[PDB]
Here is the input.
Amino acid sequence: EKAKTALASSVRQTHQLMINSKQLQANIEVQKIALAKAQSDYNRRVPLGN
Amino acid sequence: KEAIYRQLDQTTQRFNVGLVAITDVQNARAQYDTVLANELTARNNLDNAV
Here is the structure.
């Protein structure tokens, strides 16, 4: 019984890591949106400067 | 007049770029039109003085 409980705990922790992966992916999406906004602003400010 | 013309050019260039609204261009055009009347009046006053 003790061994079976240990196996259950290990499985759950591994699944937790798997979910952390998707969390980090969402963070990446946030940063990408920020970069896109900055790029649009610059590309916008450029021709005026010519 | 030179200064106001330069300002109108900047505002139009920014609107085209996509940083402002039509109302700003309308105000810039009004301000540029006013100085044109003032410049004409100055020449009339000069001729009247002569």
